[PDB]
């Protein structure tokens, strides 16, 4: 008869106390789950490493999109990550240009998303009151 689906979505995520979120939850930080797809059945989250986990990425924040639950075999999605500055604008946007293949448990994103030295410097406007606000826009290929 008829059927519908959320096929594009933008998730806004705020990490309080950014300076020591490593102290509070260690090396990895997963967001809460957000939903898309046929009857809200794809479940996703963000995955942050506030300090990158190797020698090339140690000076960076790493940022990934994780597919957490998927009843389907796979899903193909394009994504984009950006930062919400205190002025309110998107900045520092970087996009996957093509779609990548996700299955349950798989992630994709930017091991070197932004330099910790730029981000932590609060004159740059990216950490108002030690809160980092991330934006992830997703578009699932049909």
């Amino acid at each position: 008869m008829a059927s519908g689906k959320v096929v594009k979505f933008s998730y806004m995520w705020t990490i309080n106390n950014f300076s020591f979120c490593r102290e509070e939850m260690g090396e990895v930080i997963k967001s809460s789950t957000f939903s898309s797809g046929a009857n809200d059945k794809l479940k996703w989250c963000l995955r942050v490493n506030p300090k990158g986990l190797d020698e090339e990425s140690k000076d960076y924040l790493s940022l990934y999109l994780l597919l957490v639950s998927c009843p389907k075999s796979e899903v193909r999605a394009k994504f984009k990550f950006s930062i919400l500055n205190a002025k309110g604008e998107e900045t520092k946007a970087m996009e996957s240009q093509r779609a990548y293949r996700f299955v349950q448990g798989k992630d994709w994103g930017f091991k070197k998303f932004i330099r910790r030295d730029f981000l932590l410097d609060e004159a740059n406007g990216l950490l108002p009151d030690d809160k980092l606000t991330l934006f992830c826009e997703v578009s699932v290929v049909q």
């Binding site: 990934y64 994780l66 798989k106 994709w108 330099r115 730029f118």
Partner: peptide
């Protein structure tokens, strides 16, 4: 300042 390349976990 930012790198464009895309990897899995």
């Amino acid at each position: 300042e930012q790198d464009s390349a895309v990897t899995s976990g």
